Design an enzyme around this catalytic site. Structure first.
Site, PDB file in Angstrom:
ATOM      1  N   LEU A   7       0.647  -1.274  -0.019  1.00 31.95           N
ATOM      2  CA  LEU A   7       0.001   0.005   0.139  1.00 31.95           C
ATOM      3  C   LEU A   7       0.613   1.195  -0.052  1.00 31.95           C
ATOM      4  O   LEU A   7       0.545   2.350  -0.592  1.00 31.95           O
ATOM      5  CB  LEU A   7      -1.168  -0.094   1.285  1.00 31.95           C
ATOM      6  CG  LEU A   7      -2.193  -1.077   1.170  1.00 31.95           C
ATOM      7  CD1 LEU A   7      -2.750  -1.108   2.610  1.00 31.95           C
ATOM      8  CD2 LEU A   7      -3.206  -0.639   0.047  1.00 31.95           C
ATOM      9  N   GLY A   8       1.922   1.012   0.824  1.00 33.78           N
ATOM     10  CA  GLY A   8       2.879   2.348   0.712  1.00 33.78           C
ATOM     11  C   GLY A   8       4.005   1.789   1.705  1.00 33.78           C
ATOM     12  O   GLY A   8       4.031   1.129   2.467  1.00 33.78           O
ATOM     13  N   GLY A  30       9.700   6.360   5.728  1.00 30.56           N
ATOM     14  CA  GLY A  30      10.071   6.308   6.967  1.00 30.56           C
ATOM     15  C   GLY A  30       9.542   5.454   8.108  1.00 30.56           C
ATOM     16  O   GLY A  30      10.165   5.168   9.044  1.00 30.56           O
ATOM     17  N   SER A  61       7.151  -0.317   5.868  1.00 28.64           N
ATOM     18  CA  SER A  61       6.478  -0.841   4.827  1.00 28.64           C
ATOM     19  C   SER A  61       4.961  -1.524   5.085  1.00 28.64           C
ATOM     20  O   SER A  61       4.874  -2.210   6.023  1.00 28.64           O
ATOM     21  CB  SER A  61       7.107  -2.105   3.877  1.00 28.64           C
ATOM     22  OG  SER A  61       8.475  -1.518   3.580  1.00 28.64           O
ATOM     23  N   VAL A  62       4.090  -1.150   4.387  1.00 30.99           N
ATOM     24  CA  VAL A  62       2.563  -1.348   4.758  1.00 30.99           C
ATOM     25  C   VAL A  62       1.886  -2.008   3.738  1.00 30.99           C
ATOM     26  O   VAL A  62       1.830  -1.508   2.426  1.00 30.99           O
ATOM     27  CB  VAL A  62       1.626  -0.099   5.117  1.00 30.99           C
ATOM     28  CG1 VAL A  62       0.221  -0.656   5.554  1.00 30.99           C
ATOM     29  CG2 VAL A  62       2.423   0.601   6.435  1.00 30.99           C
ATOM     30  N   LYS A  74       1.910  -4.193   8.502  1.00 35.59           N
ATOM     31  CA  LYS A  74       2.916  -3.041   8.660  1.00 35.59           C
ATOM     32  C   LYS A  74       4.304  -3.823   9.275  1.00 35.59           C
ATOM     33  O   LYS A  74       4.531  -4.416  10.295  1.00 35.59           O
ATOM     34  CB  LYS A  74       2.686  -1.851   9.701  1.00 35.59           C
ATOM     35  CG  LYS A  74       3.651  -1.105   9.656  1.00 35.59           C
ATOM     36  CD  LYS A  74       3.182   0.060  10.766  1.00 35.59           C
ATOM     37  CE  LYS A  74       4.190   1.191  10.865  1.00 35.59           C
ATOM     38  NZ  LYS A  74       3.726   2.617  11.461  1.00 35.59           N
ATOM     39  N   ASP A 120       2.071  13.013  14.709  1.00 31.94           N
ATOM     40  CA  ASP A 120       2.149  13.239  13.207  1.00 31.94           C
ATOM     41  C   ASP A 120       1.037  13.238  12.589  1.00 31.94           C
ATOM     42  O   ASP A 120       0.414  12.533  11.460  1.00 31.94           O
ATOM     43  CB  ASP A 120       2.959  12.015  12.901  1.00 31.94           C
ATOM     44  CG  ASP A 120       3.571  12.229  11.288  1.00 31.94           C
ATOM     45  OD1 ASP A 120       3.889  13.584  10.763  1.00 31.94           O
ATOM     46  OD2 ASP A 120       3.960  11.434  10.772  1.00 31.94           O
TER      47      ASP A 120
HETATM   48  C1  LIG Z   1       2.000   5.433   6.532  1.00 31.31           C
HETATM   49  C2  LIG Z   1       1.287   4.481   7.665  1.00 31.31           C
HETATM   50  C3  LIG Z   1       2.273   4.031   8.781  1.00 31.31           C
HETATM   51  N1  LIG Z   1       1.854   3.188   9.472  1.00 31.31           N
HETATM   52  C4  LIG Z   1       0.521   2.652   9.428  1.00 31.31           C
HETATM   53  C5  LIG Z   1      -0.057   2.826   8.143  1.00 31.31           C
HETATM   54  C6  LIG Z   1      -1.466   2.253   7.940  1.00 31.31           C
HETATM   55  C7  LIG Z   1      -2.181   2.419   6.688  1.00 31.31           C
HETATM   56  C8  LIG Z   1      -3.223   1.788   6.643  1.00 31.31           C
HETATM   57  C9  LIG Z   1      -3.820   0.909   7.377  1.00 31.31           C
HETATM   58  C10 LIG Z   1      -3.018   0.746   8.781  1.00 31.31           C
HETATM   59  N2  LIG Z   1      -1.903   1.492   9.140  1.00 31.31           N
HETATM   60  C11 LIG Z   1      -5.019   0.438   7.260  1.00 31.31           C
HETATM   61  N3  LIG Z   1      -5.090   0.811   6.077  1.00 31.31           N
HETATM   62  N4  LIG Z   1      -3.928   1.495   5.509  1.00 31.31           N
HETATM   63  C12 LIG Z   1      -4.025   2.106   4.332  1.00 31.31           C
HETATM   64  C13 LIG Z   1      -4.912   1.615   3.263  1.00 31.31           C
HETATM   65  C14 LIG Z   1      -4.836   2.287   2.046  1.00 31.31           C
HETATM   66  C15 LIG Z   1      -3.879   3.470   1.782  1.00 31.31           C
HETATM   67  C16 LIG Z   1      -3.006   3.852   2.676  1.00 31.31           C
HETATM   68  C17 LIG Z   1      -2.132   4.974   2.702  1.00 31.31           C
HETATM   69  C18 LIG Z   1      -1.891   5.628   3.916  1.00 31.31           C
HETATM   70  N5  LIG Z   1      -1.027   6.661   3.829  1.00 31.31           N
HETATM   71  C19 LIG Z   1       0.307   6.385   3.478  1.00 31.31           C
HETATM   72  C20 LIG Z   1       0.107   5.704   1.887  1.00 31.31           C
HETATM   73  C21 LIG Z   1      -0.892   4.413   2.062  1.00 31.31           C
HETATM   74  F1  LIG Z   1      -0.117   3.542   3.077  1.00 31.31           F
HETATM   75  F2  LIG Z   1      -1.184   3.882   0.843  1.00 31.31           F
HETATM   76  N6  LIG Z   1      -3.245   3.129   3.976  1.00 31.31           N
HETATM   77  N7  LIG Z   1       0.265   3.687   7.390  1.00 31.31           N
END
Ligand SMILES: Cc1cncc(-c2cc3c(cn2)cnn3-c2cccc([C@H]3CNCCC3(F)F)n2)n1
EC number: 2.7.11.1
Length: 273
Positions: free
Chosen positions: A11-12, A15, A18-19, A34, A134
């Site tokens: 997903l992204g 810093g 990786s998620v 994550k 943040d």
């Molecule tokens: C940047 C970050 C750091 N730590 C945790 C999460 C995070 C993203 C999550 C979920 C839980 N934690 C659940 N869904 N999700 C998610 C789903 C679609 C898109 C995104 C975006 C969030 N902003 C950064 C880009 C991304 F991950 F695509 N997150 N993101």
């Protein structure tokens, strides 16, 4: 872990680590997976049973109960060189950064609903003894069906305390002038500053300050048409002196904040398309 979850696309990353998108096998429950490298963790905490764990896990557990304003931690795993967090994942979802990028500056009725929900979520964190550190568009998810907003990324967070913080690893353009100038801030008034930046970004489609000298000067110019009440609230949140900033009670009692839409109403009017 590999037998409990089916991993999907990335997903992204950045810093924060990786998620990945994922699915819980027993359930088909949508999750986010994550990964954070152990060498990249500077803030470590202790579990109630005395286990060495990233502070992020401690903060997430403190915050992860019924309230759905924060993305909840469902499970976690330790590997030789990393930790893996299993987090809830709304579907369909879009982060607020992408949303504003696509839509441009938000209508104030929508911004009001979104901002209110972020306030309720931040209040929840503070009530649970957790400071996020943040708050920004990238760290807010929009559940597009329900019109509900959810805070993510407690990787930069801390236990909430009433004394000064002298460390910061959040996003610099959201950080307050006292941090920039003196490398010190108190938790709540710093959070209110970042909320002012977030609100500006919602109604203007971009952040108000780019460089340290702009933050320190604290003069706010509106590049889009924004109501007088909204402008007033933004300028109040962005007061140079922390003690001149509003409390959360004062923000939510502000005239701009009255008659907020319910999340489902917000979705039906603004999101369903
Ligand atoms: C940047 C970050 C750091 N730590 C945790 C999460 C995070 C993203 C999550 C979920 C839980 N934690 C659940 N869904 N999700 C998610 C789903 C679609 C898109 C995104 C975006 C969030 N902003 C950064 C880009 C991304 F991950 F695509 N997150 N993101």
């Amino acid at each position: 872990l590999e037998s409990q979850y089916q991993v999907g696309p990335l997903l992204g990353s950045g810093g924060f680590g990786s998620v990945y998108s994922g699915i819980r096998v027993s359930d088909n429950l949508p999750v986010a997976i994550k990964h954070v490298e152990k060498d990249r963790i500077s803030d470590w905490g202790e579990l109630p049973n005395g286990t060495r764990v990233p502070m992020e896990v401690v903060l997430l557990k403190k915050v992860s109960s019924g309230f759905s304003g924060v993305i909840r931690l469902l499970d976690w795993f330790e590997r030789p060189d990393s930790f893996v967090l299993i987090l809830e994942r709304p579907e369909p979802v879009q982060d607020l950064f992408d949303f504003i990028t696509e839509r441009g500056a938000l209508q104030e009725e929508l911004a009001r609903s979104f901002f209110w929900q972020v306030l309720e979520a931040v209040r929840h964190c503070h009530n649970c003894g957790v400071l996020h550190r943040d708050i920004k568009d990238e760290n807010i998810l929009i559940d597009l069906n329900r019109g509900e907003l959810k805070l993510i990324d407690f990787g930069s967070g801390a236990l909430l305390k009433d004394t000064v913080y002298t460390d910061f690893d959040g996003t610099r353009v959201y950080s307050p002038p006292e941090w920039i100038r003196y490398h010190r801030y108190h938790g709540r008034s710093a959070a209110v500053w970042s909320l002012g930046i977030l609100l500006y970004d919602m109604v203007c489609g971009d952040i108000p300050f780019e460089h340290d000298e702009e933050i320190i000067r604290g003069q706010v110019f509106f590049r889009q048409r924004v109501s007088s009440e909204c402008q007033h609230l933004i300028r109040w949140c962005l007061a140079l002196r922390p003690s001149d900033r509003p409390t959360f009670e004062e923000i939510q009692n502000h005239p701009w904040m009255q008659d907020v839409l319910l999340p489902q109403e917000t979705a039906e009017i603004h999101l369903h398309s």
